[PDB]
Amino acid sequence: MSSLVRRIISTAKAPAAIGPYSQAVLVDRTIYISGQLGMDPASGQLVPGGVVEEAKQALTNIGEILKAAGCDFTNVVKATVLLADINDFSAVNDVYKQYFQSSFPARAAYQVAALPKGGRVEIEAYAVQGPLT
Amino acid sequence: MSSLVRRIISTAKAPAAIGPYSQAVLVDRTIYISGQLGMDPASGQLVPGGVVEEAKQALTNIGEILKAAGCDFTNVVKATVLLADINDFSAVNDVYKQYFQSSFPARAAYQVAALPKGGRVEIEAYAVQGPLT
Amino acid sequence: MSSLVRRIISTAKAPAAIGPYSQAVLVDRTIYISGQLGMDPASGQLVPGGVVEEAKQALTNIGEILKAAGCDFTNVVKATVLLADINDFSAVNDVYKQYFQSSFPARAAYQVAALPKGGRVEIEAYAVQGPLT
Amino acid sequence: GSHMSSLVRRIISTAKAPAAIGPYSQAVLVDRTIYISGQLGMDPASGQLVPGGVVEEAKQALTNIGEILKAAGCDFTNVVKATVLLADINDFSAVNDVYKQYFQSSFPARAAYQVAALPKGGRVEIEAYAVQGPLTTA
Amino acid sequence: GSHMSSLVRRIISTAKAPAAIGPYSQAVLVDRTIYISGQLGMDPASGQLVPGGVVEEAKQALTNIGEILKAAGCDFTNVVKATVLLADINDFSAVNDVYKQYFQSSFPARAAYQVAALPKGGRVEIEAYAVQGPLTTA
Amino acid sequence: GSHMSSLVRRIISTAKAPAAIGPYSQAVLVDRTIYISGQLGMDPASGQLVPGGVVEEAKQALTNIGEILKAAGCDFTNVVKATVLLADINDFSAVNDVYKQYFQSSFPARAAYQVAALPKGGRVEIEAYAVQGPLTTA
Ligand code: NI
Ligand code: NI
Ligand code: NI
Numbered sequence A, B, C: 001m002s003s004l005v006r007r008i009i010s011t012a013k014a015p016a017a018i019g020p021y022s023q024a025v026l027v028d029r030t031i032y033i034s035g036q037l038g039m040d041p042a043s044g045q046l047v048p049g050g051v052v053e054e055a056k057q058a059l060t061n062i063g064e065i066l067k068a069a070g071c072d073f074t075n076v077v078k079a080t081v082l083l084a085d086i087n088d089f090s091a092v093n094d095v096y097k098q099y100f101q102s103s104f105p106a107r108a109a110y111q112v113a114a115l116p117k118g119g120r121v122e123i124e125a126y127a128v129q130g131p132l133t
Numbered sequence D, E, F: 001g002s003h004m005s006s007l008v009r010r011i012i013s014t015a016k017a018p019a020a021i022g023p024y025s026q027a028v029l030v031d032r033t034i035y036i037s038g039q040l041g042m043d044p045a046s047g048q049l050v051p052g053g054v055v056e057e058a059k060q061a062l063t064n065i066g067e068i069l070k071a072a073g074c075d076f077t078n079v080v081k082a083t084v085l086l087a088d089i090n091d092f093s094a095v096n097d098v099y100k101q102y103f104q105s106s107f108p109a110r111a112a113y114q115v116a117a118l119p120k121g122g123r124v125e126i127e128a129y130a131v132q133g134p135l136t137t138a
Helices: A051-068 A086-098 B051-068 B086-098 C052-067 C086-097 D053-071 D087-102 E054-069 E089-102 F056-070 F089-102
Strands: A007-010 A024-027 A032-038 A076-083 A105-113 A121-129 B007-011 B025-029 B030-036 B077-083 B106-111 B121-128 C006-011 C024-027 C030-036 C074-083 C106-112 C121-128 D006-010 D027-032 D033-040 D079-086 D109-114 D124-131 D135-137 E007-012 E029-030 E035-041 E079-088 E109-114 E124-131 E135-137 F007-012 F027-032 F033-040 F078-086 F107-112 F122-130 F136-138
Touching: A032 A051, A032 B007, A051 A086, A051 A121, A051 D033, A076 A086, A076 B025, A076 C106, A076 F089, A086 A105, A086 A121, A086 C106, A105 B077, A105 B121, A121 C106, B030 B051, B030 F122, B051 B077, B051 B121, B051 C052, B077 B086, B077 F007, B086 B121, B106 C074, B121 D006, B121 D027, C030 C052, C052 C074, C052 C086, C052 C121, C052 F033, C074 C086, C106 D124, C121 F078, D006 F089, D027 E079, D053 D079, D053 D087, D079 F027, D087 D109, D087 D124, D109 E124, D109 F122, D124 E109, E029 F078, E035 E054, E054 E079, E054 E124, E079 E089, E089 E109, E124 F107, F033 F056, F056 F078, F056 F089, F056 F122, F078 F089, F089 F122
Parallel strands: A032 C106, A076 A105, A105 B030, B077 B106, B106 C030, C074 C106, D006 E135, D033 E109, D079 D109, D109 F033, D135 F007, E007 F136, E035 F107, E079 E109, F078 F107
Antiparallel strands: A007 A024, A024 A032, A032 A121, A076 A121, B007 B025, B025 B030, B030 B121, B077 B121, C006 C024, C024 C030, C030 C121, C074 C121, D006 D027, D027 D033, D033 D124, D079 D124, E007 E029, E029 E035, E035 E124, E079 E124, F007 F027, F027 F033, F033 F122, F078 F122
């Protein structure tokens, strides 16, 4: 069968791996993006200011990974929003909405027991390289 | 490269979005379905009767989204079952089994800390548009 | 449209299903693998020794499912690591690292409230059948 | 035999073009490519060449191709290659004046040359390849 | 050169059909499409035309195509287009009586016409295109 | 018309090969397959056959194909089928001696035969099919 493209996505505009994973993997046309915490890309540290600031940084991180793969947020087809606190759902929703102009992805969003580094939010995503009709 | 089909799936036979997401996204042949709670499609409210009733409604909701995309449960390849209580695993399993006549999907099933709206169960799914061999 | 290959993956070298799911589903070239606990394939029981032993068994289980589908760990593109305890992240990371020689998958890793059978870890994965470039 | 996708193979058949009598089809669509049998200036109803020589024949042949394309959900914009077979190379310019009426832009690849003889005494035969849309032209 | 999938390109080669001597292959499979070099009524063992004229030649040519299809994991049901080249248009009916024996249904697209000359003095040459299965016929 | 992928269809055009004047393109790339119009031994600059007979013409024709392949991001290793049309079957060996210079291994499928006449009085015309890489040869 055809040999499908498989490319590790890696940019210094997103945080370095603090464990055994790639930022994202592009395979054929689908990009599987690792869960992103609200880590400042230069320092590798959670940004201050709690869940809202962290959500903004996490989504910014995803945006830079998408850009490295020739995509933007319009390429995203599914996301998962992992919360440390379900009471933050409204606040996180309002952040998240700002990163999608259109064609809102499929999503699941819920509270887990704990995230790495005591993050308040982690977002994973799936995207498909364009062109998309 | 080819421009792949990307279609937002939306039916009034499933609940309206109470946040910034689509019910499902079809991209090429893969359908990414949002996490469904046991919400009555007409009202947008959780059905009464607890985890069993909610699981039935959530899976019914998924079925209507699949139908909107020209599919049924035989198109589903993976599901995730998110529980508010791991003690409900048996009861939810017996509900879930009724929606698959065959070719049971891959699955993961476990307890999270909280779901939106105080749901007792949420189910996400991945499907592939047929024909399938 | 073309009729895509859809094959239920099933091997006696991985645990039997204790519920209504397949070990994995191959659909076109993508393999959706069910969440694996650290269950001994012969007995269906969690191996003793806690999170480290369980992680090793879970990943071994995934390896046998990949082998049944003509793949190995280099085919994996995404994994999710579900922990019963976020303090086990380091220990689980060191186990997990041993199963990837290269091209580390995308990943998300975090603590949930409870796993089936009181497992300490569950790992799901997504793979793509080769050849991969 | 089941480890790769099963690709669509559709037999095209329309009463609006000469019937394909014997062990051939008017066209075969397979995956997205349509292979169209060479068409002569044969009248579908009569089973004979239309009168009036190479120009009338070219018109009927291209009409025939058009009806086959339509049966496959396509039109002339789907054509990516055509071969124009002639009884006389010196009829090329006159056949080209017919042919150019069917194409606007993004023209098919083409070969045109003279053969020793065509079926039915034909003076022109056109074979085409097309690709089922949608197509994005660059 | 690495940003798109690398498609399979397989050279077909079988001792059961005339050897392809010089810078050509008996057939090339690329992705799922098999392009088969035109086959004459050449005996594989002798390297010459079989005796007995156009009918014997057509049988050998189609036998040759069959062995090449088999080498590519296919049979005659995989064929989607064929071209029948003749030394004499008036041999069409007799060659067609041979050809029809190889196909049952879902027939290939076809063109048949007379050329000025074929290699080796041949009276018939058949070129075919096939698509590696599985195929779903509609 | 939007429920299947929209496949790329690219018109190939290069000044380095004879211009395609009238309702045809030098080549069409569609999905990954390139259909290349038959090329004569025509000088691009002059619009006429090069002098010196069939051997000089074959060289120019293959040079023409080369420039078209290059315009489509390909070279001769991308070619999967070619057809060699001749004014004289007895020129096959001499044209083959030219042709073999363009191919090293993994040769295209081929048909070669004599036609009654080619455009422009040509003695050789070559049509080719190619597939945009990357390609994995087995
Ligand atoms: Ni198969
Ligand atoms: Ni490339
Ligand atoms: Ni469409």
